DNA sequence: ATCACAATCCCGGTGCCGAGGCCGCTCAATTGGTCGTAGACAGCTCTAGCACCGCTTAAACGCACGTACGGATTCCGTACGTGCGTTTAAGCGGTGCTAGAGCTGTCTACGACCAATTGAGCGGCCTCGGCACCGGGATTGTGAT
DNA sequence: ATCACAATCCCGGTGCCGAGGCCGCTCAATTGGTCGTAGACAGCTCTAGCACCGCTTAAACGCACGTACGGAATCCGTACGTGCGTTTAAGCGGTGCTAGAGCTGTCTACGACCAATTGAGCGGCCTCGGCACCGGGATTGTGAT
């Protein structure tokens, strides 16, 4: 036998290709699962995770914070158009809201 | 037998919820209407959650039952509360 | 001396939109949830996380509804939200009314 | 022994923000997000296989589900990343 | 050789309103309705099975999914009908 | 070997139990399908069909017609509160709308 | 002799809420659909039933939107629907605004 | 190549659609806004329908592609428009 | 523009509890080989989508005209917001008791699989019955008289 | 209040095409036997949900007071709706051409499955450091002047 290599490392990914394949097989999605489908799915999931964490880290740094909290994820999602469109029907627990006051309610 | 706990949703709490919504001025009839709206929402979520609990043959409503019920209503929730 | 009406309201709006904590007290909300649930099944138990999750979802729902209600009140050239604003917002959203 | 994505989300986080941490509640949010996107993509791919009378979910179905679910530039970059990963995997 | 519920819908129509016909456009509407309700109930039953780590869809899952999908009086009467049919079938 | 008998006739149904069982089995819904699940599902589908057809036939008879058309189905659905809740996100082709004029727009 | 403003409008409301036929002409709608589709793929063909289904869905969507818009206009104490009414109705529905 | 076919949705057609919705008086600026709204809705539906068509390796958009694309938007349609 | 002062931001200076690292091991991922079938591909037929054209007539368009409606203005009465002293009950931390959630082991009934039988459903053909249309008449409904 | 007359309901009378009935066949549903395991049930542990209670103190409540806002009434001016003559292009029917939808047959590469191997991740413990909070101090936002 050759030295074992994870399929994630073959595809250059951090998300686990094997676990994605196992979840696809056991989820009653189809009778058979092709070889490239778990790789493609892991790649897409990793990309979306990276996008959200980059935006949330920027939001955390803007507040001089080191750790990301749910508020930073909420700010990242609601301030970015595509993420706000994808996550439109989603509530973030302890995310709060975007600061927004209607102009007619301001003084003078 | 618990009764009339809807008045535990006080006027100051409703005012805080409206302030987070950006409301500046609140009519006096808003509080009872809000109580009705909240009761309807809770009735529909809790009915679905209790259905999920009874299917599992459990007696204890879990957080995951509530999460699935909110997913029924089109109210997907990420994370959890305490 | 005394603040004009609306100054404290604008301060409160700024404060509560800055924060993320729960706005309904926990014990009354938990009593409400248990009272509602007794009508579906007697002698139910609840995980604490279950009631917490319910409170988070409920408060999010009410805040979104109040935002829509405020839009309707402003559409009517008012600054005061009224029950008819809530009725219109819920009807447009597709709720039971 | 429940399974979650915290170790991979943390790895990706250190790839994009080396000096940035994350709290456990934000990590729970991230786990919910990954699980939700997985359910959406897999369900759309299963529908695509069923509509075309196919018994296998391949990378074509995943790509079409990605185009159906993700809006705009997110879809374009996600498709690019998936194609690159599959190309790298096939040459291994 | 396409598949439709047309003959069964017609049988039910002849029981419910013996003197009443139906147009082919209205029969297409009925077919769409039957297929949509089928997909809703089956998907909710499948989710119920997956949540509880079960591998079989039984009449219990169908009953729970109907209680989840149908509102009020409709759910109670449909549950009554399903239980009655299962009881008659078991005694055969 | 006895004479064949349909599972629909055993359960006293007009909807086909065998076709429902085959559709459940091939729909990637679960690994296994119980004996009573198609019977229960067929009974529920038949009941809902009968409920809708009764209301639509009433509407058609009220319109002095003997044939049900999509307008009758739309009228029946939108006038029954339960069916309106069930079919609230559904568009009926050629269904039209419910006649409804707001009172403020009426004369004098 | 001539009818007062609104009498013919009310008659038209009763007539068009009574009927079920398509309110947009078929050739212009088909040309619009093909012109839109040419941006996503060149040399696309269409089944006739596909364009018919698209028109049915589009007309239903527009009629529902006008119902909601009319509610918004009445809420403002007007009888004329205005673009701000459409904007409010679409925002509350969650549409792309 | 087709150009500027949105104007084929005429002012009287929009008036008829408003009448079916119970609208009594219409502002003059409503017609362009309605055209914009229709163009957005059609763009989304047609993009999804063409995605379904392309996945099938077809060159003809079927009515079933349109019904799936409408089901994606949350706009389930019974029957076919013909 | 001035002035008072409450609210708000800024800069350290700690505590504390949770984020993050370390380690043993077990259980899921990986490797290699065998086999059957899913689907890729080619080739063929024949449907249905597209182009185009000429006529007819319903629909669209442009314009005149008047009035109904939208929007601005004013006025007023009270229902709201703000502040403060008093009462309430939420939150917290501790304790005790037990329902029931989660797990493990046994075994048996149920559902998959398969081969043979067979009858229900579907496609095509055919013929009348429901329903939209038309015209002549009575009903009713609107706006100036 | 009345009337002309326009919109609308009644009452039949031929057409006409779609509904619905009928028949042969094929392919999906049924029946009977075998067997593997999913799950029903029993029994056990020990987690975590519930009840109760006493203190602290923040929040809720009730009331006084004043003014900002909602609602009503008035007025005006112009952008709507309605009617009519002219233009436009949709709809229809027919003809012709061909792209491509749908099906069938062949074959082979891919994915399932199984047994052995091993390393990735998970739970548990441990420890420092990020952040919350507090207090002292400077700034500014708000209201009367």
Residue numbers in the entry:
A (entry chain G), F (entry chain C): 11 to 118
B (entry chain B), H (entry chain F): 21 to 102
C (entry chain A), G (entry chain E): 39 to 135
D (entry chain H), E (entry chain D): 33 to 124
From the paper:
Histone H3.8 is a non-allelic human histone H3 variant derived from H3.3. H3.8 reportedly forms an unstable nucleosome, but its structure and biochemical characteristics have not been revealed yet.
In the present study, we reconstituted the nucleosome containing H3.8. Consistent with previous results, the H3.8 nucleosome is thermally unstable as compared to the H3.3 nucleosome. The entry/exit DNA regions of the H3.8 nucleosome are more accessible to micrococcal nuclease than those of the H3.3 nucleosome. Nucleosome transcription assays revealed that the RNA polymerase II (RNAPII) pausing around the superhelical location (SHL) −1 position, which is about 60 base pairs from the nucleosomal DNA entry site, is drastically alleviated. On the other hand, the RNAPII pausing around the SHL(−5) position, which is about 20 base pairs from the nucleosomal DNA entry site, is substantially increased. The cryo-electron microscopy structure of the H3.8 nucleosome explains the mechanisms of the enhanced accessibility of the entry/exit DNA regions, reduced thermal stability and altered RNAPII transcription profile.
